[PDB]
From Swiss-Prot, chain A:
Disulfide bonds: none
Record gene name: L3
Note: All late proteins expressed from the major late promoter are produced by alternative splicing and alternative polyadenylation of the same gene giving rise to non-overlapping ORFs. A leader sequence is present in the N-terminus of all these mRNAs and is recognized by the viral shutoff protein to provide expression although conventional translation via ribosome scanning from the cap has been shut off in the host cell.
Full protein: residues contained: 811 to 861 of 911
Species lineage: Viruses, Varidnaviria, Bamfordvirae, Preplasmiviricota, Tectiliviricetes
Species in which this protein is naturally found: Bovine adenovirus B serotype 3 (BAdV-3)
Gene induction: Expressed in the late phase of the viral replicative cycle.
Protein name: Hexon protein
Amino acid sequence: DPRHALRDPERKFLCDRTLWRIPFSSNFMSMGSLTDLGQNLLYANAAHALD
Amino acid sequence: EAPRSLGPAPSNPSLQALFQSQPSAEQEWHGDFGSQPQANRFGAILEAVVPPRSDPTHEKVLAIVNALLETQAIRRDEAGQMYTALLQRVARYNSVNVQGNLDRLIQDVKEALAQRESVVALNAFLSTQPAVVERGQENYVAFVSALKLMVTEAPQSEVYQAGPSFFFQTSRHGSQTVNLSQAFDNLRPLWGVSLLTPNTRLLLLLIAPFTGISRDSYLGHLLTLYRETIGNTRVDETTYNEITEVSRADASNLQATLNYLL
């Protein structure tokens, strides 16, 4: 309006059927079933504690 | 691997007692008298002229308890308790004969510790193992000789009985234990003749570097192939070390070389 009342914008998004994905790949991309990691020695020959 | 006793010399309990309960001006481990003050000079002169006699009872008992600590007859945290008990007993029955016996015991335990600083179990195992087979008494004899040679020449190896079977372990805190009884029970049908269990395979792999076996026999062939495989493993280790050290001027490089190498 000519007689408006300021502003305070707020943004948001809305995913409605999506599973958030964090693939276990070095470059985050999917280059096959087995990933760049997973078959690495560090993650296949040694036990790790995830947190 | 903790130090059993405080003294810098693990052996020589008398030396350890010297280190623990003597002033650090008589000991040796490897000024200008006359300009000292009058009090110090006169004290030293009087002590030298008339030496002060002292009882060597606490020192003897400390040496004995250090010897017991080294022998592991006494735990580390009860050393003071045993020291006090021994002092009480010696004071109760103190005599010149008792002091002489204490000195003799210290000398004997020091000598025994110096001299000291599995075989019987293997002998019992061989005794309970049959010594005659119907498929050539030379492969078995040479294999037994190789086993005895390797168990004798191994620095820290143990042979022991666990119930009805005898075990062979390559080291005190290792992870290579071989059930000798079952291994020989599996080897017996095929002395002089893929079909071997992992236990006897591990036994053969362990004994191959330390072995008279005729090459015509199946065990001879298996030992030759295991020697060849072990030599290939050593040369492969050398090549892997060289290649990796050169290529490091990536863990991916180690992955690639190990995959191409096994």
